[PDB]
Point group: D3
Chain length 174, copies 6
């Protein structure tokens, strides 16, 4: 159970703990199930909508959807389901999904000796990668029903820190 | 898994399945119930990579004390250790070393890549069935041939009866 | 040089010759360069728009873009660039790309002993696969400029044969 | 056209030229088409019968089936279709396919700095690998009709050289 | 938690229990976190230094570095993080990592029906494979700071058993 | 025959023609054989020395020894053997191999819509990627090293153009 052993980490310093759920490039919707302490394959997504980044969550946080706050974790090679890591916060994708706020914190591994910690801020990523992530989350439910998801904005690390802190308060309330 | 997960909605044909072996792997991985951990029992011959994902239904028992196995069919392989709700589409009636060792045939219950295209065994390519049958008829042949036999392919109602029988065995032990 | 060694094949019988350019799942836009008689990587596409099928062409055909008529070849595992095969015609995607007609013939290998020739008509494919292909071709240029590509409609094998015969005539008269 | 400028190579030295057709692990039956000078996907094979080695041919040879002599090329990672190499001859699989002889020369790359040229005879390979290759070629047409293929025996490099020389004579005539 | 459900196994018979941490070919440094009972991605390594074998540990053992004794597990295809297996001991790599002893037991799966248990000693492996493993561990920290790691020697199964028993005593005395 | 159909391209403009021989991540040493006009697997390299980038050459150029002028082509996903492309020159790895100059032009695809043409100079790349490439070429013959393998410096695109133009002159004189 990750939400009892692991804390959110050093939110003020931008180094947080993240549990990975979905390897980049997978069209398997995998989710940590808090009740069972296990990873569940909710569904198979359309192959054209494979995840453009690794997809994870922050332990001991609560968003508007009742689940832990989501993480877009960018690496060169995909991460397996179920490993956790310390990750550097570099921004936030403000996002609405079916009427509920479901923001996603953008992260890289805190210690990345493959790119030498090259991504320290959101605009260090190629602009075209941001556009692809934006397109993915704007459209990944379109084959069921279009127009229910909306990437609202991209925020820096300080706005991401504020989002994480609010999600921490929700967890502490519950 | 056998403490948190139940077999699920067997009457509705939507069961819980825990994946052990990704499709295409020649690693014989099994959930060790005594230790609550996944064990690589052995490396199989590469020519006998699993033709489908391979898993089990929690809280079920074969007649000989074995878990009730699941052949889970997907386009891309599933990792070891993920669980899912799965649609029962049939049963491979199977004998291994004289022991009944049936395998429930399943797909993910929510498949938005093919739009839940497979609901019965006849929805699958008959040639996929023949490959699965060949695999389980021969995968032990390099050690000793003739010890495994695919007896028949049953529909979803027969599969449900096999699941319910295995639920009873679990309950009684 | 495939346009000299290969004819279109048995168009009336629905078994044609197809030369593969792009493996399914690749975001590399590879095209047969008829002038040089070699395969050219035109550009890298966004990774979110990896090709949903193999992409190929029919020898000795001309569509309106001045290239050979395109083929969407559906297989379980991707086909390498530069291999040719006899393929069963199962339909056609009517398509307009940046002002011009650029229809694509939908094909499977003529001899498929993996699925036992399971796909003979478009209705044999999962509808959700067609919907994914439609979405891909409706959106794959959106990061440069949206609204320039349109999947007009889908036809069956006799409609596809008519398009092939029209492109054979354009080749002969070039 | 590989048969125009590529020769069979140093048959007496056991270092021959091989053109690869099928990557190890592929279920795509790809064949060099001599008349067109291009690689043709003849058919998709059952996924359970993916090739257990790379599959290639010797230029300017002819076996009894009318094509160039086949090569089983063993490597740790698959080779792409259409690459040629100098290969060390380590044995021959004597083979009958649907009535006619279709022997296959067993080779490794002549220059392997990953394993330090570890394989010089068939006995240097894991015996279980040979048994897997034999099973594959004994069964790969079974879903169409069983019993039409037979691995007759395995020979060493000298029998392989004799087979190659007979195939060079067929090409010349 | 592996250190409570698993013993080291049949050390005297050379068949020990091993828990896999890093799949061969991965540049993700994954470690079993004993305090959290979970696998942690410590850092991304340079891709040029992808692990040449699977990398794991023996439960209920301690080496000089304070972690469980390491294992180099050689397989034809990589093993996933988090699986455990009975492994045959075939050798030991004697190794110093920044002034600390950190030997690694060389193992293969005890039941290998793909190669028919072809590897029983180090001399059964290609000598070039050993040289590559040696190169890797002599150089994998070089982009940070070179000259801090040294493969000291390669021992057989009997020396490996002695190393295992010493690590069992260290664990027992903790 | 790529040396007859293709020219070096627009050297002054920095957009040249490149033929790919080796996919990134491959340990297969594949070379275009000018005598036969075909791609040859010269040898299997140690797996620990897989190519860190795609590896290719510029048509109609010669090193001072008669070697074709090599290309390090950087992409996110490996390119297949045998395709050619227009590529942007972004730098040069000055390199000495066995007592001879053996420079390698650093390139990216000229039209990269996955990263949005993010890389125009060497400094645009993560500097840790450069250090990994440097380590690779300094050490890839270490298992049996018969001569120098030394990266002498990293040059910009203007120095790279001078190297290309010198190699065009040698080719024309031959
Ligand atoms: Ca969420
Ligand atoms: Ca069973
Ligand atoms: Ca076109
Ligand atoms: Ca043959
Ligand atoms: Ca250690
Ligand atoms: Ca050179
Ligand atoms: Cl990972
Ligand atoms: Cl998965
Ligand atoms: Cl292919
Ligand atoms: Cl290759
Ligand atoms: Cl595995
Ligand atoms: Cl570093
Ligand atoms: Cl490619």
């Amino acid at each position: 159970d990750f939400n009892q052993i692991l804390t959110p980490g050093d939110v003020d310093g931008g180094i947080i703990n993240v549990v990975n759920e979905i390897p980049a490039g997978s069209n398997h919707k995998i989710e940590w199930n808090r009740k069972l302490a296990a990873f569940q394959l909710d569904r198979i997504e359309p192959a054209i909508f494979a995840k453009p980044t690794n997809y994870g969550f922050i332990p001991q946080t609560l968003d508007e959807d009742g689940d832990e706050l989501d993480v877009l974790l960018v690496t060169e090679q995909p991460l397996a389901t179920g490993v956790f890591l310390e990750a550097r916060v570099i921004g936030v994708m403000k996002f609405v999904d079916d009427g509920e706020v479901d923001d996603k914190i953008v992260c890289v591994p805190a210690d990345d000796r493959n790119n030498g910690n090259a991504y320290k801020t959101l605009s260090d990523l190629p602009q075209q990668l941001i556009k692809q992530i934006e397109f993915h989350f704007n459209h990944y439910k379109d084959l069921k029903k279009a127009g229910t998801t909306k990437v609202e904005s991209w925020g820096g690390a300080e706005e991401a820190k504020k989002v994480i802190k609010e999600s921490i308060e929700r967890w502490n309330k519950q």
